[PDB]
Design a protein around this ligand. Sequence first.
Ligand code: F63
Length: 330
Amino acid sequence: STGSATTTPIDSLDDAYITPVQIGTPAQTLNLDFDTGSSDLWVFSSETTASEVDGQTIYTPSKSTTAKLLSGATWSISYGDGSSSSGDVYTDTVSVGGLTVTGQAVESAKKVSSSFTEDSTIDGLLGLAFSTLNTVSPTQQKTFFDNAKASLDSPVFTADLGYHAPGTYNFGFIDTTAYTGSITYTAVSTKQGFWEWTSTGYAVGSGTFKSTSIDGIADTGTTLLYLPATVVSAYWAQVSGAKSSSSVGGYVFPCSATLPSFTFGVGSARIVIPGDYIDFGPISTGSSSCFGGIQSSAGIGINIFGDVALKAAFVVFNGATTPTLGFASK
Ligand SMILES: CNCc1ccc(Oc2cccnc2)o1
C-alpha cells in the first residue's frame, strides 16, 4: 500500500504545516502537524477542557463506531518550545492520504497549553520519530508509520514541504518526479529516538564551503534551523545590521535586508536554502526588525534541521531495518 497527502502552511510565514487525517468511522477529518521530532499522535477532542479549545476541530470518540478506550492508558508530552498537552487514549482507524491503519493509538487531549489553544489551525500532532519516544503509559504505543510499515510497498515516508506553498507527505513510495538530481543517503542514529544524522558542513551565500561535522535531527515539527553558535554567527555577520537580541530571543535583522542563502552538506552533496526562506518577518506587527530563520542551538542541547532547512529539499525518511535519511534538491 501507499498514501499521499498534501501539507499546507498554517500562515504566511510557514510557521508550521497541517495535513488532513481521517480518524474513526464515519471519518472525522482533523488537520494535524506531522512531526518527525516526536512520536505521539494526539488530538483536540470532546474531552479537552472547554476553555482550552478556541476554533480547533475536535475528535469525538463516542461518535466513532471503531473507537475503543485503551483502558488505563494516559499520555503527557512537552515540546522544545515550552508547550505541552496530556490526556487519555483510544484506539481507532486512522487514514492518511488513502493509507489506513486499524488499531492506531489516538491520544485524546484533556489539557493543552496556551500556545496550542491559540493556534486555531492545528488540531493535533502526528508523530513520526521512533516509537521509543512515545509517551503513553503504562503500555507504550507505536507511531502511525511504525504501524503502517509492514503494509507499505517500501518502508519509507517522504517530506516535500513548500516555501509559502503546499507540499506533500508520501508513505510507501518515492516520487521520482518530485526532485532533481539524485537522492543522497546518510546514516542515522536512533539512540535518542530521533532521525539524527551528521551534516558534512556549510556555506554562507556564495562563500566557500566549510567541511565540519554537525550532528542534528531532521524535525518537521520545528519551524526554524537551529545550529551551533559559531555557524549562526558566521551567517548573520553577512547581514548588515543583524544582531542577537536577548529581549527578542534570537537573531534579528533589518526587514529591508535581502538575506544570503545558506548551504548545508549531506555527504558530498549540498542543499541550498534560499535567503528568502530565512526571513520570518517583523518581530511584532509593524516593526522594521525582522526575526531570523537560522538561530543558535546553544542551550537546546541538539542541533535541529527544522522546516527552514527541510523545505529546501525532498527528504526521505527510510525506515528499513537500518534507518537512513535521504536528501535531494528540488
Ligand atoms: C506553538 N506551540 C504549540 C505547537 C504547535 C505545534 C507544535 O509542535 C511542536 C512545537 C515545537 C517542536 N516540535 C513540535 O507545538
